[PDB]
Amino acid sequence: GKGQIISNINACVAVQEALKPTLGPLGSDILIVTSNQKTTISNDGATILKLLDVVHPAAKTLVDISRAQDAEVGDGTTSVTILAGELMKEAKPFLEEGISSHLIMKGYRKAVSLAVEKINELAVDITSEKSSGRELLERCARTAMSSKLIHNNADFFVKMCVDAVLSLDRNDLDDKLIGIKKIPGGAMEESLFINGVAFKKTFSYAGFEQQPKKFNNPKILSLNVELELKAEKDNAEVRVEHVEDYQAIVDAEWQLIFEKLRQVEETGANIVLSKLPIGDLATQFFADRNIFCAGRVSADDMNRVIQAVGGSIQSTTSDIKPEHLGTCALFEEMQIGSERYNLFQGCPQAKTCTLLLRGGAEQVIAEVERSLHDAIMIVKRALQNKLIVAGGGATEMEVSKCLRDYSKTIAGKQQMIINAFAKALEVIPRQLCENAGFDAIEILNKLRLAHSKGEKWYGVVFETENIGDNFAKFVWEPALVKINALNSATEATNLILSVDETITNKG
């Protein structure tokens, strides 16, 4: 009956309430404690909903639709749930009045169909008009970096961010291809950009002062087995009773390891990397041959080495082929932060890069690293899609405006339903002002003043509270996000309103 429908309304509001403070770059962050007892803090709606694992069917629908928003698009996972859940509150008083939810869901199909048509009209394709090649991507990075602690140092940060995208093919871009390694301690403005891949360098064992940071053309080869002979698991027991035989029964094992020398020595690989920690056995002979070795390397950073110089992983040292080797242009190692950092530079075949970040504390860089990810998506989608729309409240207000005029010509219950859907579009700009500190009541009244003057581009300024146009604020958003957000929010809402009774079997 209608009792379970009302219970599904509050279930969507409870999930929406957690994602309200996380909307926007200046929004608040949520703290969720996983069963693994690991602290996870993120403002992105995808990761938030994936860690909740809610048993409620309607609340899980908002979680499942967030994965579809992150798959086909990857941006707007927080706003798609807030918009989908807002329809549950607007349709709550309509159920008590006798209006069925089926006519409410029917009005959304006609409202979204007319809204998508208005998105293409607001999207203007511009590339070389009033813009250059270098200054195009630089002005987009300063938008997401505004109202942040890095705003003073953002001059040096944009130059390193643009070079990360240009270092890869503009046809295929991925945010996972750009790596970031946090460096505790040091000045923020002293960070540099690296063309190759780097790792954390957790190797604490001795044999330092050699393998200098200056290399010419080192050869890279992947390693599988362990170089050390120490057996961690198995063992053996053999004992003799002869007194004079105690001499040589302590002696010879490592001579068997010499069998793997000539195979590796004739290869000439100057870089030794593996997914297992390198032992304490030989740190020297490699340095005599100008061969470098680094142990305790994570498995995630080993896959980037294969895509860099074109290496390969072989189990033994016998069948290793000579053409699997690769070399970089230059090597660099920095001791800043009381820790050595190994990084490769000048790899022409590298499909990945690494950007180092420095700061006062580790928690300070965590806010800088995540604030950069929002700027990378704006720079990445600029070259991929040439159709962009004005964001920051601009597009969200006009989509709700056109539905008010078109509803006047429509007769029946669909008039108040489209007007309710248009009113439901005001939750997106609301939380953006409340999370940024601005009063949502005063802006909502003042923004609708110039919004009726015939200009559809008026947005909301995120720096200083005021009404105006985001065109001067350099706030750009792609058209694929606004189109897929209305379809994903409506489809997820139609499935919840179409289920009157919830049945859960235990077993």
Place this chain on the structure above:
Amino acid sequence: QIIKSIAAIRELHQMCLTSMGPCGRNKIIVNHLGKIIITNDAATMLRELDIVHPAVKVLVMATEQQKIDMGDGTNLVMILAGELLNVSEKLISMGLSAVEIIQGYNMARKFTLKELDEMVVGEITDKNDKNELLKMIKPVISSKKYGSEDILSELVSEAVSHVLPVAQQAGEIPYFNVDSIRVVKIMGGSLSNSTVIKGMVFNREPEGHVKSLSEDKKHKVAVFTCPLDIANTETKGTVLLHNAQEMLDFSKGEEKQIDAMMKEIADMGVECIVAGAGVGELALHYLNRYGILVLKVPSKFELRRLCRVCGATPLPRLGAPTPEELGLVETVKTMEIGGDRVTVFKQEQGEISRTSTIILRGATQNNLDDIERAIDDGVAAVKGLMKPSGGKLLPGAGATEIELISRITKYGERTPGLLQLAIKQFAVAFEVVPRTLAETAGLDVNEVLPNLYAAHNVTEPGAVKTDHLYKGVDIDGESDEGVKDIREENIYDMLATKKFAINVATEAATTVLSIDQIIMAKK
């Protein structure tokens, strides 16, 4: 006690009232494995739900008759049988025994089934044309995922035409098969990217360096049931470990024996080896040099239907490539379906096969489950297209249920005796079908009902009926006011579905009304 059995079903009666129809509602049922499963078909939901009430099981067993023997009417039998219990409360309150109630339905059943022969105007010629099959398949695919019935109609109509072989003037040998059509689903893509392919699409990885074979026709395919391993002896032949000297013969022995078995197979021209069980590591290295595609089928249910497509036969032994057990396929390629590279299995002209696969694409995982199950229910109605009244049809969507009311009330005063009370209540029980269609569509109950009576009841000075008897229950939500001809959208209920559902609905309510006492134990 007879009221408690009806009240327990009445609480579950409203669940099935929202099933039938495109504007209805669906129920979310959490499976015992921790997976949310939702579907429109009630026969599937009743199997997942655990109900110890035997009175409910009477309607569940009657629902399986609509799911198995027919491809449509699972939601209709639950509405008709549930309404017969509510209208029977008026006769029980007056003091009428259950004998005249059951006898009244039996007398009204023969009167209804006799009039169904006159309800058929047009007859399907069974042309099996792509455009002609869209008339019967559309109403079966409908009432699920409303709005997608236009695109999904071409997928089923084209797949059924591929299953039916070309023949004329022969109705003795059956043609269509239900299990020969398997539907696949992959996350990603859109609905417009779907197509119709003849074969069984394999979503498994190629497992080897050979992605696809050449374009030459009649590729030799070998299906091996025994897994790939070193050749052993059928009698005893147990390999054990004793001394380290035999360890070298175990590794080096498997290299020479497996390479010798694969050489004799490649010499005969076999480009494909199908292994139903696991494949060893050493076997994948030899198949790369001989140019043999690696294909694994872990499901033993697909091996029986594969013999009727390519023509290959499973071999319980290994190393004996008998040419009589080898099949032939024209085209084997590798295409990207849903974003991943998969090996496609299809053909062109020769070796006509009855196995077809409808490829589906979409972002939502739950929406792909209903569309996949709707195709199985859509192709199941093809079996009902045979000689036993497969061409006869009747207008649906509330057109027939209202028209039959005028014929039942005419026979009420004609038949003397106590049966007059059961005949009048027999026609009233059919008013629940058009009422649920108006409630789920948002229309008022006081609107659609009086408009249907005035449309089918007119004063015509003549014997031959005029105007239109095809007026159904309109969803409205568009145009201006009133209803429209249901024949314009080519939506109708097949007579084999409606006529067979009447006999099931009467027997379902007869058992409940005939049981005046129940005895169970606490569980």
Place this chain on the structure above:
Amino acid sequence: GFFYSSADQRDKLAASERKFVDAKLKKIIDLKNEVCGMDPDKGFVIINQ
């Protein structure tokens, strides 16, 4: 036991034991053609529990 070096040699030893069944099938098929073999409206059915 079955001793074979190659898979082709296994069919020679396996068919040796199958000749016992094929020898009895030759006498069964001869009974059909012996009595009303070519006569119409005739049949031969094997129960074989």
